[PDB]
């Protein structure tokens, strides 16, 4: 239940693509993901600040939030060890040859809502909610993550050491945050990202494929351009299109909270989707 101090000797591994990440087989505990944050020539000393922060992160415990299983804190090697989510990210599931049924998509949306309401209920503002931070297990249940690791203050800090040998977010970023280095993220910013995730779940693709240039898209979105609702070929219930439109509202105060989305979406899910 708690964070375990693991040793590098307890594993064997393999590389992978992510915000490096390598799957690892633990000698006695089985398959895990190891994210190595620092591998260096400098024995570092503030091991406790790194360990306490992982214990503090480990306090976010919910069925829809990725669990940290352990940490490797040793001479020149610092790694986060996490549970493996076997299907990868939500975009990989959506672009797969087999199509996800509407009932399973409905459940995925509800589970994203539950995860986000839980995080906001803990005073945690995600700032990069997007399909790559939504992980999927073999049963198609989701768990929200933060692969950039911005939420872990010291682990991010430790990565930026200079004796250490070691974007795309724009589509999901709320327009107040676009072209601004100082915009502070709010719960309503995450609600905006959820609306674009909602569109992508039904379009099975990334938004704005016809955008020629990044400054064009940034200026377009700020003037009120949104993902094309007509470019959803599959059937999206009118209730979800209405919700998507309310959540990407230009005015942040018009956007609902995740608890208010849950109250509306769950009865609809149960009555209309499964
Ligand atoms: C094809 N590729 C994959 O198959 C694939 C890729 C990455 C995977 C994975 C499978 N299976 C687990 N990963 C994984 C999970 C987490 C991390 C890094 N860790 C976190 O993101 C994290 C976030 C939190 C709590 C939190 C959540 C949301 C907002 C703020 C804070 N905690 C405890 N850890 C790295 C890899």
First to last CA, the chain: 32
**At residue 40, what are phi and psi to the nearest 5 degrees?**
-140, -175
- R_g of the chain computed on alpha carbons: 20
By three-state DSSP, how is residue 127 classified? Answer: coil
Same domain, 156 and 246: yes
Q: Are 255 and 246 in contact (CB under 8 A)?
A: yes
DSSP code for 270: I
Q: Is residue 128 among the annotated active site residues?
A: yes
> Which of 84, 101, 120 is the C-terminal boundary of a domain?
84
Ligand 1 contact via 262 beta carbon (within 6 Å)? no
Domain span including residue 149: 85-274
**Same-domain check for residues 223 and 117:** yes
Contact assessment for residue 67 and residue 56, using Cβ atoms and an 8 Å cutoff: no
On whether both 13 and 89 belong to a single domain, the answer is no
- The most distant pair of C-alpha atoms in the chain lies apart, rounded to whole Å, by 59
Is 243 annotated as a binding-site member? no
19 and 123 belong to one structural domain: no
Q: Indicate which CATH number applies to the domain containing 18.
A: 3.30.200.20
Query: How far is the C-alpha of 31 from the C-alpha of 52, rounded, in Å?
Result: 25
Dist. CA 32 → ligand 1 center (Å):
11
Q: Which of 84, 117, 144 is the last residue before a domain boundary?
A: 84
How many other CB atoms sit within 10 Å of the CB of residue 139?
Answer: 8
Residues 94 and 228 in one domain: yes
- Experimental approach was X-ray
- Based on the number of CB atoms within 10 Å of its own CB, is 171 exposed (0-12), middle (13-18) or buried (19 or more)? buried
DSSP bridge partners of 197? none
Tell me, yes or no, whether 223 and 249 share the same domain: yes
Q: Which ligand 1 atom is the nearest neighbour of the CA of 86?
A: 4
Same-domain check for residues 173 and 59: no
Distance 31 CA to ligand 1 centre (A): 14
Considering the domain architecture, whether residues 43 and 104 belong to the same structural domain is answered as no
DSSP state at residue 5: E
Nearest-angstrom CA–CA distance, 124 and 120: 5
For residues 137 and 126, give the distance between their C-alpha atoms in angstroms, rounded to a whole number. 21
Rounded Cα distance, 222 and 85, in Å: 35
> Cβ distance 11 to 27 under 8 Å?
yes
Q: Residue 227: which CATH number? A: 1.10.510.10
The domain boundary, picked from 84, 99, 116, lies at 84
Beta-bridge mates of residue 70:
4, 81
Nearest to 102 by CA among 265, 272, 262, 231: 272
> CB within 8 A of 191, min separation 6: which ones?
247, 255, 256, 257, 258, 261
**Would you say the CB of residue 57 lies under 6 angstroms from ligand 1?**
yes
C-alpha 270 to ligand 1 mean position (Å): 29
Q: Please state the domain count of the chain.
A: 2
């Amino acid at each position: 239940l708690n964070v375990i101090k693991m040793k590098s000797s307890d594993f064997l591994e393999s590389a992978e693509l992510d915000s490096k990440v390598s799957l690892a087989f633990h000698r006695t505990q089985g398959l895990m993901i190891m994210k190595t944050v620092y591998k260096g020539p400098n024995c570092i000393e503030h091991n406790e600040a790194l360990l306490e922060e992982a214990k503090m992160m480990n306090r976010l415990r919910h069925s829809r939030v990725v669990k940290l299983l352990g940490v490797i804190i040793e001479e020149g090697k610092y790694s986060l060890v996490m549970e493996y989510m076997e299907k990868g990210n939500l975009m990989h599931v959506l672009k797969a040859e087999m199509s996800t049924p509407l009932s399973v998509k409905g459940r995925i949306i509800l589970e994203i809502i539950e995860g986000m309401a839980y995080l906001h209920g803990k005073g945690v503002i995600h700032k990069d909610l997007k399909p790559e931070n939504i992980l999927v297990d073999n049963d198609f249940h989701i768990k929200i993550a933060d692969l950039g690791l911005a939420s872990f203050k010291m682990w991010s800090k430790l990565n930026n050491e200079e004796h250490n040998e070691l974007g795309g977010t724009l589509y999901y970023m709320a327009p107040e945050h676009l072209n601004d280095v100082n915009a502070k993220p709010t719960e309503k910013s995450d609600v905006y990202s959820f609306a674009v995730v909602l569109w992508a779940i039904f379009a099975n693709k990334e938004p704005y494929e016809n955008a020629i240039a990044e400054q064009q898209l940034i200026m377009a979105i700020k003037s009120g351009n949104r993902p094309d609702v007509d470019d959803i070929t599959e059937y999206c219930p009118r209730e979800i299109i209405s919700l998507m439109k309310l959540c990407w509202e230009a005015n942040p105060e018009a956007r609902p909270t995740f608890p208010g989305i849950e109250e509306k979406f769950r009865p609809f899910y149960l009555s209309q989707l499964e």
